[PDB]
Design a protein around this ligand. Sequence first.
Ligand SMILES: Nc1ncnc2c1ncn2[C@@H]1O[C@H](COP(=O)(O)OP(=O)(O)OP(=O)(O)O)[C@@H](O)[C@H]1O
Lengths: 304, 335
Amino acid sequence: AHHHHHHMENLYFQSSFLPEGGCYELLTVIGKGFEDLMTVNLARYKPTGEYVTVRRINLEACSNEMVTFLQGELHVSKLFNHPNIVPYRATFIADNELWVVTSFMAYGSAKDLICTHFMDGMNELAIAYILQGVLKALDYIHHMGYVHRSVKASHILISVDGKVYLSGLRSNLSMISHGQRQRVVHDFPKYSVKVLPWLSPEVLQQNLQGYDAKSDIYSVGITACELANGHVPFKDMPATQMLLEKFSPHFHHFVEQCLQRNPDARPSASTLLNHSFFKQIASEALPELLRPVTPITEVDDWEF
Amino acid sequence: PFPFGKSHKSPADIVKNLKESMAVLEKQDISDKKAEKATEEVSKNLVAMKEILYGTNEKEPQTEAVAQLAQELYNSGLLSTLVADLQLIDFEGKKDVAQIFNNILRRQIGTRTPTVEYICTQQNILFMLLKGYESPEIALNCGIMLRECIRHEPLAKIILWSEQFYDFFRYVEMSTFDIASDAFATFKDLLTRHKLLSAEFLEQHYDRFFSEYEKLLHSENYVTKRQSLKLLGELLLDRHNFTIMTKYISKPENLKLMMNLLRDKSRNIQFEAFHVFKVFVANPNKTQPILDILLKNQAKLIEFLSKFQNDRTEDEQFNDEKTYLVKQIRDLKRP
Ligand SMILES: Nc1ncnc2c1ncn2[C@@H]1O[C@H](COP(=O)(O)OP(=O)(O)OP(=O)(O)O)[C@@H](O)[C@H]1O
């Protein structure tokens, strides 16, 4: 029994985007994913003229399992609210397609940046700012009893004012079974052929011991190598890249810690944030480090 | 943020603190600082309660603390108050309410399940959770809580036999797809988990349910139509629903609709239509109006079925089913 039924009016003087296709004017394709079934569009939100991202997937090309997998992403993304996790703004059917609207990050992904300019890898200070944001996000995701399962450069987005966001929530997996946290989980990440090189040995070797949040920590290290070199380790290497999986000195010790064979030996994201590597340190330091990249501102019918 | 120490508090004092802080939040006529203070206190108490029930990364929950807490929670009516006032709570506290609620609900002393017993004395909790779908700020957390409630048969029965159940037909077609999906998940669980209960519900409310269900099959929303058509097939092929199924497949207008959905533009839709259509024809005791529709389109159906998703190549059930339906329809004699 409360006295806040004037809430509709209490705020709406502001929020959500209208969950209707017509509100968006599609401009350029800015990206592609979900096994080539998703088109990522830059869009104009008509009621404000503001720029947004529209993610589009034809549900007719999806199996039942693929639709379930996709609805899971929408559930998990509404549970998360964090300065370094990409916000979702609207989700609706524009018929036959799932439309998912998120805020537009004007420097694109860390991989985009590598491809447009930093082909040989990014400067080290930049990597520290970028990986700190990823780690803050992972700390939150891990405290919530989730594993990310797809930390890579293309799942790190940078906004007009240099804020870093972890994306890629589609691959997120709960370890909470029967109301309780499980020490290890066993699910092989579905539709992740391509994410393999960032995956820890214990996620890859299915039917063995299983994994926890410290598997994401290994992916942080792979990403560190990807960001330094401009290419991911084990690229073009056959599926049995497994076997082989079995700059300032602080950076080296950072990477070597993430990449330990034993996950129990790997530090958590919170203690990794206290690592020497980040002492060299955000929304005014990164845009400059990204110079000279500029963002833009048959049969006839039945008879009855 | 200046890092003060945390002083230890009993479950009883935590319940008390939260009760008093919730009372402040319900009031309109308080200063911004007083509201802010109560907001912070609610939040901190909820974190404290969660940690008693789940423990931490360092400590597992201890039974004495848990039992004191559950007892206190039942005596105070706070399980009702937190659902009723859910809108007044911060983003992360709303998720804490869900977790606390879910954990208490799973609580099990012997064979007994005490929270189920308690919600049976306090049934508006269920109806407040269901109504939560209409409010974007609380909908997801309400859904999570409701879906844990309906795991228990007595609570499932209360919702199924209510007027409010039919609100689901609105909720599953909501234009925010995350909430519509959540609601359809709860709706499907209700109809499929406790199969005896569901069979009884369908027999007793046949006409209203299928009148509402018919509207879903006409939906302008592609997923609503696809999902609903799929659930329909799964419902009719279930042995618990045999009586309901025999009623359904005797009505001319239902055959009409399935036959039409076989000619939909969506390959997925026409395949899920097949799953229901096949049952009308496999039926050895076809009524006259049904028999009339099949004989009227005898030649067209045989032709249609011969060329129906022929590229669907190693589904051996689908292939044999199509062969069977063609034989059946060919074997139809006009008296
Ligand atoms: N909010 C955004 N702002 C700017 N660009 C974006 C945004 N979201 C996605 N993109 C672009 O689209 C690309 C593909 O999107 P995303 O990574 O979400 O798809 P994916 O299915 O996870 O990719 P893959 O299947 O290749 O792993 C991103 O790497 C990025 O370049």
